[PDB]
Design an enzyme around this catalytic site. Structure first.
Site, PDB file in Angstrom:
ATOM      1  CE1 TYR A 116      -3.358  -2.968   1.075  1.00 18.69           C
ATOM      2  CE2 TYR A 116      -1.995  -3.177   3.085  1.00 18.69           C
ATOM      3  CZ  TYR A 116      -3.011  -3.661   2.246  1.00 18.69           C
ATOM      4  OH  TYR A 116      -3.655  -4.827   2.566  1.00 18.69           O
ATOM      5  CB  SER A 140      -3.220  -6.285   7.733  1.00 21.49           C
ATOM      6  OG  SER A 140      -4.237  -6.896   6.933  1.00 21.49           O
ATOM      7  CE1 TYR A 141       1.252  -8.650   0.629  1.00 16.44           C
ATOM      8  CE2 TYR A 141      -1.006  -9.517   0.361  1.00 16.44           C
ATOM      9  CZ  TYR A 141       0.315  -9.397  -0.098  1.00 16.44           C
ATOM     10  OH  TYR A 141       0.700  -9.995  -1.272  1.00 16.44           O
ATOM     11  CD1 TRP A 187      -6.803  -6.232   1.211  1.00 19.11           C
ATOM     12  CD2 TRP A 187      -6.446  -7.621  -0.508  1.00 19.11           C
ATOM     13  NE1 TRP A 187      -5.446  -6.312   1.021  1.00 19.11           N
ATOM     14  CE2 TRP A 187      -5.193  -7.158  -0.025  1.00 19.11           C
ATOM     15  CE3 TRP A 187      -6.473  -8.507  -1.606  1.00 19.11           C
ATOM     16  CZ2 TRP A 187      -3.966  -7.552  -0.599  1.00 19.11           C
ATOM     17  CZ3 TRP A 187      -5.248  -8.905  -2.186  1.00 19.11           C
ATOM     18  CH2 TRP A 187      -4.010  -8.422  -1.674  1.00 19.11           C
ATOM     19  CG  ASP A 190      -8.133  -8.897  12.931  1.00 21.61           C
ATOM     20  OD1 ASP A 190      -7.374  -9.819  12.581  1.00 21.61           O
ATOM     21  OD2 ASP A 190      -8.193  -7.804  12.352  1.00 21.61           O
ATOM     22  CG  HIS A 228      -8.323  -5.939   9.622  1.00 24.66           C
ATOM     23  ND1 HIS A 228      -7.445  -6.848  10.169  1.00 24.66           N
ATOM     24  CD2 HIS A 228      -7.744  -5.495   8.481  1.00 24.66           C
ATOM     25  CE1 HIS A 228      -6.381  -6.949   9.395  1.00 24.66           C
ATOM     26  NE2 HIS A 228      -6.539  -6.141   8.364  1.00 24.66           N
TER      27      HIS A 228
HETATM   28  B1  LIG Z   1      -4.817  -6.197   5.812  1.00 26.83           B
HETATM   29  O1  LIG Z   1      -3.705  -5.732   5.036  1.00 26.83           O
HETATM   30  O2  LIG Z   1      -5.466  -5.023   6.224  1.00 26.83           O
HETATM   31  C1  LIG Z   1      -5.688  -7.185   4.992  1.00 26.83           C
HETATM   32  C2  LIG Z   1      -5.084  -8.114   4.078  1.00 26.83           C
HETATM   33  C3  LIG Z   1      -5.884  -9.025   3.352  1.00 26.83           C
HETATM   34  C4  LIG Z   1      -7.290  -9.025   3.534  1.00 26.83           C
HETATM   35  C5  LIG Z   1      -7.901  -8.121   4.432  1.00 26.83           C
HETATM   36  C6  LIG Z   1      -7.105  -7.208   5.158  1.00 26.83           C
END
Ligand SMILES: *[B]([O])([O])C1=[C][C]=[C][C]=[C]1
Length: 570
Positions: free
Chosen positions: A40, A113-114, A162, A255, A283
């Site tokens: 991102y 997250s990712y 996503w 989450d 999340h």
């Molecule tokens: B996270 O980066 O916020 C995330 C990754 C994959 C799917 C949902 C959230």
């Protein structure tokens, strides 16, 4: 004091160069390094950092921080496809860091997250220089979280939401401004504003916008409903038990990755120094404040305390300070109900009593005004609760572990769906003494259907004296995957099956005046996609070719349907 170098190009094994930003301290010699892999934009530090740590403190204290744009995004070269290149790209980046003049041979990782998933992908490489990781709200098994789940149903809102977020990022970073970009931006915004409506299209696999911008949505996710070889290829879980890498794991009760985040702690705790912190967050909502439930200001993501803990963790494993984690607990949980943070020695808690709470009651358990009960004693009479599940009218998702579709209200009031005939409610009598439920939650239900496949859902709820029916944890079991997520088999109509429903985990004290409630149904849309009740390839079916199912829950002596609650008595 420190310096920042932008767009340093790091070559991978195939010649493709990934762009990194170097935050290096003004020091005499080499320093320990921390790596963050971001899809991102590495330049956009404020977007994710508020959900992680005040990491500039690490740089002011002598650590170097490297933030990288993942393959094919922003300043990086190559082509972007989620997950598939991260193991190799992380190994090559870690190797490059170790070769640099400013690195002392000690590398660590942190992120959410990712940016957390990529750490597990880096950990399995076997690079000696990687001394510790700190994955927050992450998973080591992509099928189990966030794409599908332990029950085998597609987390459709997670996928479309996503993919739309990444689609927005893929457009603002490609080769030249295209004429269709403006129209695509509005269409992606339409999906994010109504993820439920986007998930309602039949066939689900027909995604004109998302399938064009990111083919992976269909090619990998939608097209592979079974936990097959394509998923096992990117899964890191089975390799976790063989590692000896310390991990500071953070999770949230609401989450989407909670079940998997906690499972990673259990997988690494025996071979290395694993730490666990779990708050009442979803999340996208780390404030501790929700529409009908406030956890207090102490519940707000403690960013500075997290920064101090991460620094102490990295000081022990990357700097060799043996007493750096003195006084710091192994496990730190926010126990809801009493709404307090509590230190623990292990996860699952040492004193956990896995107690069955049996489904019972006089008459039909349909709706909140029905006769459904929950008791630690087996029901004396053989009864059955029946309802009609119509895919055209699924039970709406309200709170829980939603990621993109209304994912900011985890502890949602369940009253808006209480009037539904397809929502079976079972409650204990009003409690006179507190009952603490902290640990993994599951249900064992004796079920039957008129169809050759259907879904069964179970939701744990805390009923407040004022009327609020607050959601805690939930799960689903897609019948074809009742025994295995890898090799599905259909069911026979009218036959009774004993199935397990994985309801992830929670920490809640049901205070005096409250009731413990369980909701049973056959849908939870769009948290999970709708079962067609046909036994077909669900994502390729038209709404008109889908069937309604007459589903039944059996309860009594010979069919002891129950929810297993992790009881803590102190
Ligand atoms: B996270 O980066 O916020 C995330 C990754 C994959 C799917 C949902 C959230």
């Amino acid at each position: 004091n420190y310096s920042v170098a932008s767009n340093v190009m790091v070559p991978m094994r195939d010649g493709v160069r990934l762009a990194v930003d170097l935050y290096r301290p003004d020091a005499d010699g080499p320093v320990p390094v921390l790596l963050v892999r971001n899809p991102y934009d590495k330049f956009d530090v404020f977007a994710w950092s508020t959900q992680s740590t005040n990491w500039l403190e690490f740089v002011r204290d002598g650590y170097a921080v490297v933030i990288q744009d993942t393959r094919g995004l922003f300043a990086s070269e190559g082509e972007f496809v989620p997950h598939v290149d991260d193991e190799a790209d992380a190994e090559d980046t870690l190797s490059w860091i170790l070769e640099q003049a400013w690195c002392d041979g000690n590398v660590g990782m942190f992120g959410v997250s990712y940016l957390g998933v990529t750490q597990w992908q880096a950990a399995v490489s076997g690079v000696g220089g990687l001394k510790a990781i700190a994955p927050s709200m992450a998973s080591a098994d992509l099928y189990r979280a966030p794409w599908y789940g332990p029950g085998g149903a597609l987390s459709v809102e997670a996928l479309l939401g996503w993919s739309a977020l990444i689609g927005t990022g893929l457009i603002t970073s490609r080769s030249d401004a295209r004429p269709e970009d403006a129209a695509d931006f509005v269409q992606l915004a339409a999906i994010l504003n109504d993820v439920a409506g986007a998930a309602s299209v039949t066939p689900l696999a027909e995604q004109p916008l998302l399938g064009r911008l990111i083919p992976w949505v269909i090619d990998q996710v939608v097209d592979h409903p079974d936990n097959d070889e394509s998923w096992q290829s990117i899964s890191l879980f089975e390799r976790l038990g063989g590692l000896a890498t310390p991990a500071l794991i953070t999770a949230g009760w609401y989450d989407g990755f909670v079940g998997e985040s906690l499972r990673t702690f259990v997988a690494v705790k025996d071979n290395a120094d694993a730490r666990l912190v779990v708050g009442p967050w979803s999340h996208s909502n780390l404030t501790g404040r929700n529409a009908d439930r406030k956890f207090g200001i102490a519940a707000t993501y403690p960013i500075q305390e997290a920064t101090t803990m991460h620094k102490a963790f990295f000081d022990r494993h990357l700097r060799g300070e043996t007493d750096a984690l003195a006084g710091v607990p192994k496990v730190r949980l926010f126990v809801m109900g009493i709404d307090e943070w509590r230190d623990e020695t292990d996860w699952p808690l040492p004193d956990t009593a896995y107690t069955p709470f049996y489904l019972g009651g006089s008459g039909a358990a349909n709706t909140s005004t029905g006769g459904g009960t929950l008791s630690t004693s087996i029901s004396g009479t053989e009864s059955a609760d029946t309802y009609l599940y119509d895919p055209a009218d699924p039970v709406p998702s309200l709170g829980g572990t939603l990621l993109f579709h209304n994912g900011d209200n985890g502890p949602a009031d369940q009253r808006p769906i209480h009037d539904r005939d397809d929502v079976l409610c079972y409650s204990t009598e009003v409690l006179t003494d507190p009952v603490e439920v902290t640990g993994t939650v599951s249900a064992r239900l004796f079920v039957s259907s008129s169809a050759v496949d259907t879904d069964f859902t179970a939701k744990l709820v805390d009923v407040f004296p004022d009327g609020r029916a607050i959601a805690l944890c939930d799960g689903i079991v897609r019948m074809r995957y009742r025994e295995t997520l890898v090799n599905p088999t259909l069911i026979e109509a009218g036959e009774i099956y004993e199935v397990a429903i994985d309801m992830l985990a929670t920490s809640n004290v049901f205070l005096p005046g409250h009731r413990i409630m369980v909701q049973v149904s056959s849908s939870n849309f769009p948290k999970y996609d709708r079962n067609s009740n046909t036994g077909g390839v669900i994502a390729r079916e038209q709404l008109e070719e889908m069937c309604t199912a007459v589903n039944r829950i059996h309860r009594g002596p010979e069919h002891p349907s129950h929810i297993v609650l992790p009881i803590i008595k102190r």
